[PDB]
């Protein structure tokens, strides 16, 4: 896997951000994490949704460098979103959300599971520490 540079356009939710990639505007879905969402009337503004969403926003908004890392399987989902690991100044936003108890480790589909063990480890910590979603 290699990282590639990208530029923020707009954060949309805990798990979704709009980036400029290879010169094209693209919506990205964070690989392997499910956050509470502020989207879906089939739901609404679930609990810790506003929190997960401000976490992703701040982190991506305040960064020097954003990088996207595609996994080894399909790179877009059925809605046309890029599927990736997103890094803000070297820190993976997907792991940070899970480390802070603001995301669950999603249902994993091979072969898009390269960082799955890593994230599960952080998730177990977040649970142990009873943070947010786990409290």
Tell me, which fold does domain 1-135 have in CATH?
OB fold (Dihydrolipoamide Acetyltransferase, E2P) (2.40.50)
Of the candidates 29, 67, 99, 123, the residue annotated as catalytic is 29
What is the C-alpha separation between 2 and 41, in angstroms, rounded? 37
27 is in an annotated binding site: no
Among 51, 81, 99, 123, the one annotated catalytic: 81
The pairing of strands 82-88 and 24-30 is: parallel
- For 36, 40, 85, the CA distances from 126, given in Å and listed in that order, are 15, 26, 19
DSSP state of 43: S
The answer to whether 34 is a known ligand-binding residue is: yes
Distance, in Å, from the CA atom of 38 to the CA atom of 32, rounded to the nearest integer, reads 18
């Amino acid at each position: 896997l290699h990282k590639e540079p990208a530029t923020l356009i707009k954060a949309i939710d805990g798990d979704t951000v709009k980036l400029m990639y290879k010169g094209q505007p693209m919506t990205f879905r964070l690989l392997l994490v499910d956050t509470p969402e502020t989207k879906h009337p089939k739901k609404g503004v679930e609990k810790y949704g506003p929190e997960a969403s401000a976490f992703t926003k701040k982190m991506i908004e305040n960064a020097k460098k954003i990088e996207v890392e595609f996994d080894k399987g399909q790179r877009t989902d059925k809605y046309g979103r890029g599927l990736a690991y997103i890094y803000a100044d070297g820190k993976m936003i997907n792991e940070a959300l899970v480390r802070q108890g603001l995301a669950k480790v999603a249902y994993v589909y091979k072969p898009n599971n390269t960082h799955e063990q890593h994230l599960r480890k952080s998730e177990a910590q977040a649970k142990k520490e009873k943070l947010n979603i786990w409290s």
